[PDB]
C-alpha cells in the first residue's frame, strides 16, 4: 500500500491523507473498478512514483493556470489539449480511464471540495475550469 509518513505525506501532497480518505472511499464506493485498481497497482508504488506524479499534476496545473487565467475558454484548443495530457498521465497512475469514464469524474470533481481545495490551493477558481475543460475535451475525443 501507500508507503508514507504523516510528515512525509505533506512533502508530496501537503495535507492530503489517504488513510483517512481510504476508509471514506470504502464506504462511498467500496467496490468500484477505478478504486480497486488504485489499490492493485499502488501496492507497488513508492514515494519516487507519487512525487514524479505530483510534479506531473503541478506541471499540468501550471499550464492550466497560465492558459485558464489568460481568460481562455475551456473548449479552447489550448484547454482541450490540456485535458488530453490530463487523461494520459492520470490513467497510467491509477487506472485506464476513458473519455466517458473520467469526463464524469470531472463533473463530480466539484462535489467533494476536498479535491477542489487541495487542487485549487494553487489557484482560486480552477477546479471548475478543469471540469469544463475536461468534460468538453471528452466531447470531441469521444467518437
Amino acid at each position: 500500500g501507500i508507503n508514507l509518513t504523516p510528515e512525509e505525506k505533506f512533502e508530496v501532497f501537503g495535507d492530503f491523507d489517504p488513510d483517512q480518505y481510504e476508509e471514506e472511499v470504502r464506504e462511498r464506493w467500496g467496490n468500484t473498478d477505478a478504486y480497486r485498481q488504485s489499490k492493485e497497482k499502488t501496492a507497488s508504488y513508492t514515494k519516487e512514483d507519487w512525487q514524479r506524479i505530483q510534479d506531473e499534476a503541478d506541471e499540468l496545473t501550471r499550464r492550466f493556470v497560465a492558459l485558464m487565467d489568460a481568460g481562455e475558454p475551456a473548449d479552447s484548443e489550448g484547454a482541450m489539449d490540456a485535458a488530453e495530457d490530463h487523461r494520459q498521465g492520470i490513467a497510467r497512475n491509477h487506472y485506464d480511464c476513458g473519455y466517458e469514464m473520467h469526463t464524469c469524474l470531472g463533473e463530480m470533481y466539484v462535489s467533494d471540495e476536498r479535491f477542489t481545495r487541495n487542487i485549487d490551493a494553487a489557484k482560486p477558481g480552477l477546479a471548475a475550469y478543469m471540469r469544463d475543460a475536461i468534460l468538453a475535451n471528452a466531447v470531441r475525443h469521444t467518437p
Binding site: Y21, V25, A34, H94, E100, L105, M108
Partner: peptide, 12 residues
C-alpha cells in the same frame, strides 16, 4: 472514485 482528495474519484 479513488482517494477522495487528489484527483480521481467515483461516479459516472
Amino acid at each position: 472514485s479513488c482517494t477522495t482528495c487528489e484527483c480521481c474519484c467515483s461516479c459516472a
